C-alpha cells in the first residue's frame, strides 16, 4: 500500500511538471501568433496601398 502511494506521488509530480511545461509551450506559441498577426496586418496594409 505504501509503495503504491509513493508511485502515485511520483506520477503526480511528473504530471504537474510536464503539464506546466505544456502551459509554457502554448503560451509562447500564442505570443508568437500575435506577433505574426501584427506582421500580417502590415502585409495587408501594404497590399491595399499597392492595389491603389
Amino acid at each position: 500500500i505504501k509503495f503504491t502511494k509513493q508511485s502515485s506521488v511520483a506520477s503526480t509530480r511528473n504530471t504537474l511538471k510536464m503539464a506546466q511545461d505544456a502551459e509554457r509551450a502554448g503560451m509562447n506559441t500564442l505570443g508568437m501568433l500575435g506577433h505574426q498577426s501584427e506582421q500580417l496586418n502590415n502585409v495587408e496594409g501594404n497590399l491595399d496601398l499597392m492595389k491603389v
Binding site: 500500500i1 503504491t4 502515485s8 506520477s11 503526480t12 504530471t15 505544456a22
Partner: protein
C-alpha cells in the same frame, strides 16, 4: 493459646488491557486499497497529457 493467621481483605489492584474497533480491518480501508486503481488512473492523466504536451 492464640495469635495471628490470615488477614487483609480491603486491598487489591488491577491492570487493564484493550482491544480495538473491527471496521479498522486491514490497513487498506478507503484511501489505501483504492490507491492501486487510483494510480492507474493517474498514470492515464500523465500519458494523455504526455500526448497533450507532445
Amino acid at each position: 493459646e492464640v495469635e495471628a493467621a490470615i488477614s487483609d481483605v480491603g486491598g487489591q489492584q488491577i491492570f487493564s488491557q484493550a482491544l480495538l474497533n473491527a471496521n479498522r480491518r486491514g490497513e487498506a480501508k478507503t484511501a489505501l486499497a483504492e490507491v492501486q486503481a487510483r494510480h492507474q488512473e493517474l498514470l492515464k492523466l500523465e500519458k494523455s497529457m504526455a500526448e497533450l504536451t507532445q
